[PDB]
Amino acid sequence: TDVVIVSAARTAVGKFGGSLAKIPAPELGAVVIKAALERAGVKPEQVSEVIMGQVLTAGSGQNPARQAAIKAGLPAMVPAMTINKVSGSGLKAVMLAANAIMAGDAEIVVAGGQENMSAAPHVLPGSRDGFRMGDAKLVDTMIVDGLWDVYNQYHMGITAENVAKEYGITREAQDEFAVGSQNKAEAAQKAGKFDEEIVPVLIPQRKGDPVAFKTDEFVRQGATLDSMSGLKPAFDKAGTVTAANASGLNDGAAAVVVMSAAKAKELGLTPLATIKSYANAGVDPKVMGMGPVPASKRALSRAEWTPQDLDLMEINEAFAAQALAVHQQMGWDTSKVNVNGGAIAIGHPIGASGCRILVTLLHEMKRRDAKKGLASLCIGGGMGVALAVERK
Amino acid sequence: TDVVIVSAARTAVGKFGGSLAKIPAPELGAVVIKAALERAGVKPEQVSEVIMGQVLTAGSGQNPARQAAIKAGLPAMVPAMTINKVSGSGLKAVMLAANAIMAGDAEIVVAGGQENMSAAPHVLPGSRDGFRMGDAKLVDTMIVDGLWDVYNQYHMGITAENVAKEYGITREAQDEFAVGSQNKAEAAQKAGKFDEEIVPVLIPQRKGDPVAFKTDEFVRQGATLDSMSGLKPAFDKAGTVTAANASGLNDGAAAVVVMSAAKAKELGLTPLATIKSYANAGVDPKVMGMGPVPASKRALSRAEWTPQDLDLMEINEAFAAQALAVHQQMGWDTSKVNVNGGAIAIGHPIGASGCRILVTLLHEMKRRDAKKGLASLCIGGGMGVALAVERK
Amino acid sequence: TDVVIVSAARTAVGKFGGSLAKIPAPELGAVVIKAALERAGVKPEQVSEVIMGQVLTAGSGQNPARQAAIKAGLPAMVPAMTINKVSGSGLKAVMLAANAIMAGDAEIVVAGGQENMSAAPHVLPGSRDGFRMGDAKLVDTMIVDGLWDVYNQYHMGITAENVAKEYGITREAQDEFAVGSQNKAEAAQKAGKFDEEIVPVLIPQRKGDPVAFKTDEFVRQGATLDSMSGLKPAFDKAGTVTAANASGLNDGAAAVVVMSAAKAKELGLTPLATIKSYANAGVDPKVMGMGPVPASKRALSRAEWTPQDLDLMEINEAFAAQALAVHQQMGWDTSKVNVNGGAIAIGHPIGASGCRILVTLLHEMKRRDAKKGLASLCIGGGMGVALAVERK
Amino acid sequence: TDVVIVSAARTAVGKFGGSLAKIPAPELGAVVIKAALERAGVKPEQVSEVIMGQVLTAGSGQNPARQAAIKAGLPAMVPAMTINKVSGSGLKAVMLAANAIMAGDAEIVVAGGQENMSAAPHVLPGSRDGFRMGDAKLVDTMIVDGLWDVYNQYHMGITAENVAKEYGITREAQDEFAVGSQNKAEAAQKAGKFDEEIVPVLIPQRKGDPVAFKTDEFVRQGATLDSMSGLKPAFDKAGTVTAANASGLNDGAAAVVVMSAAKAKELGLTPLATIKSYANAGVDPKVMGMGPVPASKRALSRAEWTPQDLDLMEINEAFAAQALAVHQQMGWDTSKVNVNGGAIAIGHPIGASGCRILVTLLHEMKRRDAKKGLASLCIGGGMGVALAVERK
């Protein structure tokens, strides 16, 4: 059975401490679930399942994906499930949706991701035992759960250095990559290219009515090489990775409605694309940034496509260091990658990004009539995911 | 094609603060992943994916299933994903594994779950923005993420009172059911019925050699009705639910290896059973304990079996009130359910319980040569899951 | 012996979270100890003892008064002690310094107080024992140690409401009194009246050289009764005390140098004033704001003065409600009280305020050649202190 | 013209986590203030002031000395003040009382100290501003406020090592001195020597009436040199200081009632002793243990006594290393010092110790009919206090 995507919706991506900071992640997920459904013309009643990625879940309450489904107005009869494959989560949700539809387990699935990194708490390990003597640590959940390698006991940014070193990716190269990502995002914003895919979030106000948030507020206007060349390295003093050549910490959500090609025809719906293939993959945690290479290669082998056959790709930009090594290793046309900018510019709400970049992908494929697309992301812990789509 | 379970393993279940209290959930998962694979005859390199449920993940680190997979001996090339469908997570991981195999996405999946309720920490909401003036709250992640209804803002034990009230499940019925579970579990312990399925966990000692932990230490030997009759309600002064007729807070893990029947044959392995069918369902959060009814009915319909066709069942005993309502509504033969006792006696590590009970099911089906089996659980937030297995 | 005050110095008072928020209280004390000695012309090694009030000492390290003395450049041979009598602390240090010199215990004492309310942390009571299950509290040390009545378990602002009820002090009356304090403080700033008494604090900056902080930044310019009428009650929703008719939360320090008349004659120093008398008093915690009545009466009885003999007074303005009641019960001439504004305008760094007001008193007595003066303050928990001074 | 001590009371000293662990310090204080007044035959209403040392006050509430007075049943009319001079606090309070009486400021003062080290909590610095990104420290208040040198940034135990190096005090001498201390305390306990001075604290129980705590439960009966000679140094690998030759972390309170000799005659009371003299001193923080040398010399000079005129002394044993160096430098007869043991055996509740050793001294002087005694203590941050008393 051929699996299609019938709609795609994302929030604008908030800055850290920004416009979405007080909006809990399942409330962001609800916005995009409700809007994905409306745009597909599928009633809440008709949904078989909701699957939402969310990484940072400490104190979020039972099953955040169910919370989003219910806030979106889906009835209690529709089950939901939360998933955590770190940055891969939002796209892995769509892979799971596809698996379920192919197996006959589900007919229509809303899949996506949600994340509020701003609101992530601190945790007190051992709080039940107490601390008989000496200092104790309050651990940052966003770092430990989101940004810290279990196996090597260091920041993701160190894996980015490992990659830079291994693959010979210079500071200059990474900064040039980052300015390209900012400049492209800026040009796309101003050209109106994000207008269709963005769904507004109504922010409550102390006094008067709520005000819509609907612009990617992390995008740096007028960015220049020389605004990046001067920063010091963030993770190692002799390093190459900075705040400007890595993605941000951000808030946001993204969803897609998926169903069999046969169900779409029955409902009279025109799909956006057909899911062609997808794959996961694993690599050493030390170089997790390289995840997208084996995953993209596997997705492409499954599709019977080469990297040259692709018209458009969205490869998540966790760090310019890894994004560049990935391009080098894949050999594909970088002029067709992240054509509207990437995470360095737009931001990276971890559990959501996987579906965010697919939403952007789908909208640009239609705009330029591209037929073959792929979305891929690296995953902390040493993994990758990739999903290929086709219009025709 | 056709999906088979080739092996199954679980830890003994620890009591709250008990023998497993200091061993992180992913360390529990690794024990069972490693032993499932040994029991099946499968080399770590041959695994396609690991899916593990884990509900309480505050400060657990990046992707707890990945941590379990790596700690089990799986190579970095083997991807892994964590899921949260609350008490259903365990059995939902097997469902996801099945979908994946049927869709041709994976060949060999290790599916299961893991939980250490003892070690769940407290969290400090708003730590990131500070507390300008006034007291702050540390929140218990076990309650908020594991046991608390989001929509109605009370404990699961209140949902159990709503089910008792709706279905006319009495305190005395609940208590006799609880004694029954204890007595059945006692019998099984004394008969060595759990010897095969349990994998020991080595507990480090203050001095000397590690001690093997391999007995379900929550089970109460010699339990009687007069030992339960006089307790006071735990959640509601006028209520029927007590600590003796509900399960506990517990630690443990369980896992199964899943593959296509064609892969089993290629490798020369003899399956424990075939997956016949499965299903999920949603109900009102208020009466979440009733989830296994629509889930089991759907799973049965899909298998084209009646309730009377089943030879053995494992239905999770979150609360006696709910288990009894499910039996009342399904009308099946209670003498074939939880034949070696259930969660009230053995315990309930939430993220692991769904796979735990499957593991117990499969082992007993072999000993009594049962042909048709069903496992089902209820799920906080108003869901159920059910999975039917066939031997022949 | 007659005890004289030979010099007096205070910081500007900072806003909550304002210019001094990042300077630990003993660094603030060190500024005023160093400047008071320098203005007296007394070398560091001639000092017998340092006495500093500081109320909020949680995590401040051993003996905040000794920390100040050492940072000020006094040798280790000069012993120091910290004291806590809440808002009375700063004045009570001067009383203790007088007691010591009269007893022959000490020759030259540096006495005052120091407080950083901005930097007071939260505390975790019960942390050695751990938290078995459910919510735990982080308690705000500024509130519990500073602003909370032990005996009645409610804020100091409720004692202010109690006083306004008992003595018939209306919202409007409180608001006019507050406008007066602001308008006198603003007049005094514009006329340079704080110029002599304030010692700058250098504040490090992101770029370039440190900036001097030397102006009372809490003072509200152009205050009128309409400025006050829009606030809502801050502590009792049905009451009359608001943030604009109560003092602030503030940071600062003050110190004076005290010695016998004979020692000042031997060193050739012309005193600012002679200590005439002083006293303490206790009242019911519920009306602590009245403490200055029995303490002032007792100080005046000891001096052999009447309230009408005073030329100038500084009565600390914790709350307009209590300041008014005090004036009403003393019957003294309010045109002579807080002539350059009070704590409602200047702010109220709790441990330091008692000496801050003395410094202000002394400078204005010298400016207008007033002969008889009195400083008094109320104290949480139901106390007053008062100190009378005489120039001649 | 002449100040006397009319009564003396202390609690038994609690071991860390032991019988007093749940009793807040001001409750401890209240036991001894109440009992010292009863023993003196003084009416609470005729008390002029209460002065109590307390070093660890995080979350203790407003002015712990007032809380103790009030709990002891002293009326609101009696003011109180808390002081911190670290281990000197307890004795310093008596000195302040003497000063006050000699100045004519007070007639009758209850002075001492109180401390519960067991209950000192953890604090969260920076909690008010928040932790935007990163882990945050919980700091142990007992250590930072009680036991850590600000200037050198190390434990008090390191100052004891500097003392040992400087004065040639060997591990062997330290262990001999610790054994002697334990042995003398055990002997004094067995002989009934602490019976009169101890006031019971009633410890509430699970069921039934409270049980009285009335023994110094930290004293190690049966102590031998071989029990101490094998221990590892606690602070410095090449050092000499161990847990066995230092005092502990302890809970307890002590108070005395001080008045003029004229007031005692008027009220018909027979004094315990006459304060002959007292003094403080300052030394380098690095060798704070030496504080009692200059303070004792100065107190003996003020008394016109030589070290040989002394009949009995109490010199606090915070560390055997510093106690021996003090004896070495004073040259006095060590057979008359800490004749019933000292802090190594009895314990060291920091803010109370200074008064504790005074209470012990006075009781022993009366049984021996000793005429001239001295108490003295070292103080963290480099200070010392001493007080001489005479009977005749």
Side-chain angles (χ1 to χ4, degrees):
Chain A
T1 189
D2 272 16
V3 182
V4 298
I5 295 156
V6 177
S7 66
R10 65 170 181 91
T11 70
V13 173
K15 274 182 316 204
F16 195 64
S19 289
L20 298 182
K22 308 286 137 177
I23 302 171
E27 292 194 33
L28 297 171
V31 172
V32 291
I33 285 162
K34 187 186 193 175
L37 289 166
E38 292 167 348
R39 290 176 184 192
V42 170
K43 280 201 183 84
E45 271 206 338
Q46 286 151 22
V47 185
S48 303
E49 194 183 14
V50 176
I51 304 173
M52 297 295 281
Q54 186 182 319
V55 186
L56 298 180
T57 67
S60 306
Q62 270 181 345
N63 188 357
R66 175 77 154 176
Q67 303 177 38
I70 296 164
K71 287 180 139 78
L74 301 210
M77 79 184 175
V78 184
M81 165 183 51
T82 312
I83 73 168
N84 176 7
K85 197 192 189 74
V86 209
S87 269
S89 304
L91 189 63
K92 176 63 186 209
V94 183
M95 298 160 60
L96 292 175
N99 286 346
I101 295 155
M102 292 175 74
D105 187 39
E107 302 178 346
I108 299 169
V109 185
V110 188
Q114 58 195 212
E115 204 76 68
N116 181 335
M117 298 182 74
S118 292
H122 283 74
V123 62
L124 224 199
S127 53
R128 282 196 210 288
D129 302 325
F131 316 89
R132 186 189 135 95
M133 209 159 103
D135 297 0
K137 285 175 54 176
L138 246 186
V139 181
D140 191 335
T141 66
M142 177 189 73
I143 295 179
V144 185
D145 296 332
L147 296 170
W148 190 262
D149 189 55
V150 174
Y151 316 98
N152 299 281
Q153 289 293 126
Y154 53 44
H155 209 281
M156 291 297 94
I158 301 306
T159 76
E161 300 287 3
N162 289 339
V163 161
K165 177 207 180 119
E166 171 63 55
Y167 297 84
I169 309 304
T170 58
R171 173 60 184 276
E172 304 102 287
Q174 293 173 53
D175 294 342
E176 269 194 33
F177 184 92
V179 184
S181 171
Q182 289 294 358
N183 295 168
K184 286 183 285 166
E186 175 174 22
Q189 266 188 321
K190 285 176 182 188
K193 280 171 190 182
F194 296 135
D195 291 5
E196 188 179 16
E197 65 197 64
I198 288 166
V199 52
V201 177
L202 296 175
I203 306 310
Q205 308 287 307
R206 203 157 142 69
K207 218 267 284 260
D209 265 36
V211 169
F213 168 74
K214 52 192 294 196
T215 2
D216 293 297
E217 63 184 11
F218 182 62
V219 179
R220 280 240 298 285
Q221 316 233 249
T224 68
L225 224 101
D226 282 353
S227 80
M228 303 205 173
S229 324
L231 305 182
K232 312 154 216 87
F235 295 110
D236 172 22
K237 284 58 264 286
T240 60
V241 178
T242 72
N245 62 38
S247 56
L249 309 170
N250 308 82
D251 308 328
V256 99
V257 176
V258 188
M259 65 176 72
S260 64
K263 182 56 81 163
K265 183 169 280 93
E266 165 171 21
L267 294 174
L269 311 181
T270 305
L272 308 183
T274 296
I275 294 163
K276 180 72 173 203
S277 69
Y278 49 84
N280 52 24
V283 298
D284 187 317
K286 279 173 187 71
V287 294
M288 70 87 200
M290 304 303 297
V293 177
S296 289
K297 288 186 174 180
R298 202 153 168 265
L300 291 167
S301 153
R302 292 169 159 190
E304 304 193 321
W305 293 348
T306 66
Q308 290 69 41
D309 287 327
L310 301 166
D311 299 315
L312 228 33
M313 310 74 128
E314 283 284 329
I315 308 302
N316 200 44
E317 309 178 333
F319 306 93
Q322 58 79 216
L324 287 154
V326 160
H327 299 332
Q328 169 198 108
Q329 297 302 297
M330 291 303 298
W332 48 32
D333 187 351
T334 69
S335 77
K336 300 183 182 112
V337 183
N338 294 353
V339 105
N340 297 333
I344 294 179
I346 295 166
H348 186 21
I350 51 179
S353 282
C355 189
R356 204 288 295 172
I357 66 169
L358 181 58
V359 165
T360 293
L361 205 213
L362 288 165
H363 287 260
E364 185 59 32
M365 288 179 75
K366 178 164 164 177
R367 183 171 310 113
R368 70 166 68 188
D369 199 13
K371 311 300 190 106
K372 293 185 214 282
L374 186 290
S376 189
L377 310 85
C378 68
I379 317 182
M383 292 170 284
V385 284
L387 178 155
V389 294
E390 187 170 27
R391 302 174 59 259
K392 246 91 140 197
Chain B
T1 214
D2 175 303
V3 189
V4 303
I5 297 154
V6 180
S7 67
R10 72 178 180 91
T11 61
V13 177
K15 60 177 57 170
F16 195 73
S19 316
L20 296 182
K22 308 187 323 162
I23 299 190
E27 301 185 34
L28 294 180
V31 171
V32 300
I33 283 165
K34 179 178 220 200
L37 288 169
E38 284 160 354
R39 290 181 183 187
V42 174
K43 303 189 159 199
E45 30 168 291
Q46 290 186 107
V47 180
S48 309
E49 199 180 7
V50 169
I51 304 169
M52 298 294 278
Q54 185 177 324
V55 176
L56 309 177
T57 60
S60 301
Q62 276 195 339
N63 190 357
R66 184 62 165 178
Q67 302 184 51
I70 291 186
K71 291 154 145 48
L74 294 173
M77 56 163 196
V78 185
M81 166 181 62
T82 310
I83 72 165
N84 176 9
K85 205 190 182 72
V86 214
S87 281
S89 306
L91 189 64
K92 185 76 185 184
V94 178
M95 298 159 65
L96 290 180
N99 285 345
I101 289 154
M102 290 306 304
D105 191 33
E107 301 206 288
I108 293 173
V109 181
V110 190
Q114 57 196 215
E115 209 68 67
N116 184 333
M117 300 184 80
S118 303
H122 290 81
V123 73
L124 212 207
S127 56
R128 203 172 302 277
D129 30 299
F131 310 99
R132 284 156 22 82
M133 197 188 69
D135 298 341
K137 194 163 52 190
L138 289 167
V139 166
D140 188 328
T141 59
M142 174 182 55
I143 304 178
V144 168
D145 297 331
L147 307 169
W148 195 256
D149 194 67
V150 171
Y151 314 99
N152 301 274
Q153 290 297 122
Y154 47 49
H155 205 281
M156 300 290 95
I158 302 296
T159 73
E161 295 292 356
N162 302 335
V163 171
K165 188 195 286 213
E166 199 150 331
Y167 294 86
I169 316 308
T170 60
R171 165 58 184 282
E172 172 158 276
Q174 287 175 52
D175 288 349
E176 300 178 10
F177 183 84
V179 167
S181 188
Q182 298 284 12
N183 296 165
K184 294 187 288 181
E186 190 188 337
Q189 291 191 310
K190 289 183 150 147
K193 295 204 177 159
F194 301 131
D195 289 2
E196 199 181 3
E197 74 199 53
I198 283 168
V199 43
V201 181
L202 293 201
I203 315 307
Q205 298 296 302
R206 181 57 214 194
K207 210 52 80 85
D209 288 338
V211 159
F213 166 71
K214 62 178 164 165
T215 311
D216 296 302
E217 63 188 12
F218 190 55
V219 173
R220 213 161 84 222
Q221 303 196 256
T224 50
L225 181 57
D226 290 345
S227 81
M228 301 191 187
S229 302
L231 283 128
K232 336 300 302 311
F235 302 101
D236 182 317
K237 319 315 212 179
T240 59
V241 178
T242 77
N245 70 20
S247 189
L249 314 170
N250 298 100
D251 302 338
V256 95
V257 179
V258 201
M259 63 181 81
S260 70
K263 179 59 49 156
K265 176 186 296 181
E266 178 184 319
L267 294 167
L269 313 171
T270 309
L272 294 179
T274 301
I275 302 177
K276 184 68 175 182
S277 71
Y278 46 92
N280 56 20
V283 297
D284 190 291
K286 287 179 169 59
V287 297
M288 69 98 192
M290 297 312 299
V293 170
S296 286
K297 295 192 174 175
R298 286 182 96 218
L300 289 170
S301 170
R302 289 175 167 188
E304 326 201 52
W305 298 343
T306 69
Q308 284 74 28
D309 292 325
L310 301 166
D311 299 321
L312 211 58
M313 304 80 122
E314 285 279 316
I315 310 301
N316 204 44
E317 303 170 0
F319 303 82
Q322 62 82 212
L324 277 169
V326 168
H327 298 330
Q328 178 191 101
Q329 291 294 308
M330 293 300 299
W332 45 38
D333 185 342
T334 62
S335 87
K336 300 181 171 175
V337 187
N338 295 355
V339 111
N340 298 325
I344 287 161
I346 296 157
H348 186 21
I350 51 183
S353 266
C355 195
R356 204 280 296 160
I357 67 170
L358 182 58
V359 169
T360 291
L361 211 221
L362 288 162
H363 285 262
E364 187 64 11
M365 284 182 80
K366 191 183 191 206
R367 286 189 293 272
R368 31 171 88 193
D369 190 34
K371 296 305 165 122
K372 305 191 195 290
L374 183 290
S376 183
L377 303 91
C378 62
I379 302 183
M383 285 165 282
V385 293
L387 187 139
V389 282
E390 182 156 47
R391 306 176 50 261
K392 261 135 189 157
Chain C
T1 179
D2 276 27
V3 184
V4 301
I5 289 165
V6 172
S7 60
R10 72 167 176 96
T11 67
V13 180
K15 247 192 278 188
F16 196 55
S19 308
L20 293 186
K22 295 189 336 156
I23 311 281
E27 295 181 16
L28 296 183
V31 167
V32 300
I33 287 169
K34 186 173 180 189
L37 286 171
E38 274 164 352
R39 295 168 171 207
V42 170
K43 293 181 205 191
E45 65 266 35
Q46 293 173 79
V47 178
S48 310
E49 198 181 4
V50 178
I51 301 175
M52 296 297 270
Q54 191 179 319
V55 181
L56 302 175
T57 63
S60 294
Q62 279 180 343
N63 190 2
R66 176 70 158 186
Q67 290 179 61
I70 286 169
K71 287 169 135 60
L74 303 196
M77 102 191 148
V78 179
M81 157 191 65
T82 307
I83 73 167
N84 171 18
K85 194 176 188 86
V86 217
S87 280
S89 302
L91 197 61
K92 182 67 190 192
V94 186
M95 308 173 44
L96 292 176
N99 283 348
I101 287 156
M102 292 177 87
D105 194 23
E107 304 221 302
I108 301 168
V109 183
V110 180
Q114 64 203 203
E115 208 76 60
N116 188 329
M117 298 186 76
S118 305
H122 286 74
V123 63
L124 233 200
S127 52
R128 309 196 184 268
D129 309 305
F131 304 95
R132 179 114 217 286
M133 219 160 89
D135 302 325
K137 217 172 152 176
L138 252 97
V139 166
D140 189 329
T141 64
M142 181 190 74
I143 303 171
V144 186
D145 299 338
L147 304 170
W148 195 256
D149 182 65
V150 171
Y151 319 101
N152 293 284
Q153 290 300 125
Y154 55 48
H155 200 276
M156 286 299 94
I158 305 291
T159 78
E161 298 288 0
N162 295 338
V163 167
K165 281 198 269 95
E166 192 177 4
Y167 293 87
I169 314 294
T170 64
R171 171 62 184 278
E172 165 81 273
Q174 290 174 54
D175 284 358
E176 294 170 358
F177 176 87
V179 171
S181 184
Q182 295 288 359
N183 292 172
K184 295 185 279 172
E186 174 177 15
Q189 283 184 323
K190 301 187 152 142
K193 298 184 176 161
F194 293 135
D195 278 14
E196 282 223 305
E197 82 198 44
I198 289 174
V199 40
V201 182
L202 305 167
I203 313 296
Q205 305 291 298
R206 187 60 235 168
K207 281 282 298 212
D209 289 359
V211 176
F213 171 64
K214 53 180 189 189
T215 295
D216 297 303
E217 67 184 1
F218 187 55
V219 172
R220 292 173 69 195
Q221 268 125 46
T224 63
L225 155 53
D226 315 292
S227 301
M228 309 298 167
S229 313
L231 286 302
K232 284 177 295 211
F235 305 101
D236 168 0
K237 295 281 230 295
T240 59
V241 175
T242 70
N245 68 34
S247 42
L249 305 164
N250 302 93
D251 312 329
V256 95
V257 178
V258 192
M259 60 177 76
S260 72
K263 185 64 73 157
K265 191 154 264 123
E266 162 199 306
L267 292 184
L269 313 173
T270 299
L272 286 172
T274 299
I275 295 182
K276 183 64 173 193
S277 76
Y278 43 87
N280 50 18
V283 303
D284 193 301
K286 286 179 174 72
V287 286
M288 63 94 201
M290 307 302 302
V293 171
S296 296
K297 286 185 177 187
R298 190 153 194 284
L300 292 168
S301 177
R302 289 178 170 183
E304 306 195 324
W305 299 342
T306 59
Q308 292 67 45
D309 285 318
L310 301 164
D311 298 315
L312 230 40
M313 303 82 119
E314 284 283 308
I315 307 307
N316 188 52
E317 304 183 353
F319 307 89
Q322 58 83 210
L324 286 165
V326 165
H327 298 331
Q328 174 213 103
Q329 297 295 295
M330 289 306 291
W332 46 36
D333 179 352
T334 59
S335 74
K336 291 175 188 136
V337 183
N338 296 359
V339 107
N340 298 334
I344 297 183
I346 296 151
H348 185 22
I350 50 184
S353 283
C355 196
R356 198 288 296 162
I357 71 170
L358 182 52
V359 170
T360 298
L361 200 219
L362 293 167
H363 289 265
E364 178 61 31
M365 289 180 77
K366 189 242 101 219
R367 196 184 71 74
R368 68 166 67 185
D369 197 34
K371 300 308 172 167
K372 301 181 179 190
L374 186 286
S376 192
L377 314 95
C378 61
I379 306 178
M383 287 179 293
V385 286
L387 181 145
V389 292
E390 199 186 8
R391 297 172 62 260
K392 256 151 217 149
Chain D
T1 8
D2 176 316
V3 170
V4 301
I5 297 157
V6 177
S7 70
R10 75 180 177 88
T11 63
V13 174
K15 76 163 63 157
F16 190 83
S19 298
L20 298 180
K22 293 212 278 272
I23 299 179
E27 294 170 27
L28 295 184
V31 168
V32 305
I33 287 164
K34 188 179 168 145
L37 293 168
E38 293 168 339
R39 292 170 181 192
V42 171
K43 309 161 168 191
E45 12 125 316
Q46 47 182 190
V47 176
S48 306
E49 201 180 17
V50 175
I51 305 183
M52 297 293 270
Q54 182 173 328
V55 179
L56 310 173
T57 68
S60 291
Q62 270 184 348
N63 184 357
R66 177 63 164 187
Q67 299 179 52
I70 280 164
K71 288 186 150 61
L74 277 59
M77 64 182 267
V78 181
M81 164 184 51
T82 306
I83 64 174
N84 171 17
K85 196 178 190 86
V86 207
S87 280
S89 300
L91 198 55
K92 182 73 171 176
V94 181
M95 308 163 47
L96 290 181
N99 279 351
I101 288 159
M102 288 308 284
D105 187 43
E107 294 170 311
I108 297 166
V109 183
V110 181
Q114 56 196 214
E115 206 76 64
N116 181 333
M117 306 178 68
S118 309
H122 293 73
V123 62
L124 184 55
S127 62
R128 203 177 304 282
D129 342 327
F131 310 104
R132 53 130 28 186
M133 184 176 78
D135 292 351
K137 226 159 51 171
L138 275 174
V139 168
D140 189 317
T141 60
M142 177 184 73
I143 303 185
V144 177
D145 298 334
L147 312 175
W148 199 253
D149 188 73
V150 171
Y151 316 97
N152 292 280
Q153 286 301 129
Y154 51 51
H155 200 287
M156 297 297 86
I158 303 302
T159 74
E161 301 286 359
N162 304 332
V163 171
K165 289 185 173 108
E166 195 183 334
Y167 294 90
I169 312 293
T170 67
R171 161 69 180 276
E172 189 275 338
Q174 292 177 41
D175 285 0
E176 291 258 300
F177 180 91
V179 166
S181 182
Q182 291 290 2
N183 290 172
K184 288 186 291 172
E186 179 178 4
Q189 281 190 312
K190 294 308 301 285
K193 279 175 185 177
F194 300 131
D195 297 351
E196 177 178 25
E197 74 195 53
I198 283 170
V199 48
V201 185
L202 303 163
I203 301 307
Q205 304 290 298
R206 181 87 146 75
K207 231 290 304 314
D209 293 348
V211 165
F213 175 63
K214 68 214 199 170
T215 192
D216 290 305
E217 68 188 4
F218 188 57
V219 173
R220 289 174 15 86
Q221 290 109 122
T224 55
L225 192 54
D226 293 331
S227 73
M228 294 188 194
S229 295
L231 285 162
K232 324 291 202 139
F235 301 104
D236 164 12
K237 272 270 164 69
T240 62
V241 173
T242 66
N245 62 30
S247 197
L249 309 168
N250 296 94
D251 309 330
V256 91
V257 173
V258 189
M259 67 183 62
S260 62
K263 179 54 58 156
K265 183 189 289 172
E266 178 209 298
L267 294 171
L269 319 167
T270 297
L272 305 183
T274 299
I275 296 180
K276 180 72 198 207
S277 78
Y278 48 87
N280 49 26
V283 301
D284 192 298
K286 292 178 163 85
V287 292
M288 71 91 197
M290 300 309 298
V293 173
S296 300
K297 289 185 175 192
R298 222 169 177 242
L300 286 174
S301 181
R302 287 178 164 178
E304 303 182 32
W305 294 349
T306 74
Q308 293 74 42
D309 286 322
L310 292 173
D311 297 321
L312 212 60
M313 309 79 127
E314 285 277 324
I315 309 290
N316 198 49
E317 311 177 345
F319 302 89
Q322 55 79 209
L324 288 169
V326 165
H327 297 337
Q328 182 193 95
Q329 292 297 306
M330 293 303 298
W332 48 35
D333 189 343
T334 63
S335 71
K336 292 176 180 88
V337 175
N338 295 4
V339 99
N340 300 329
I344 296 176
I346 295 162
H348 185 18
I350 56 191
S353 280
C355 192
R356 208 283 299 161
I357 65 176
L358 181 56
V359 172
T360 293
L361 201 216
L362 293 168
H363 288 262
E364 186 62 30
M365 295 176 81
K366 186 180 169 180
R367 285 188 296 267
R368 299 203 172 200
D369 196 23
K371 296 309 167 76
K372 298 187 213 331
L374 185 130
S376 186
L377 304 97
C378 68
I379 305 189
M383 286 174 293
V385 286
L387 191 149
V389 296
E390 203 170 14
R391 298 169 68 260
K392 246 80 156 217

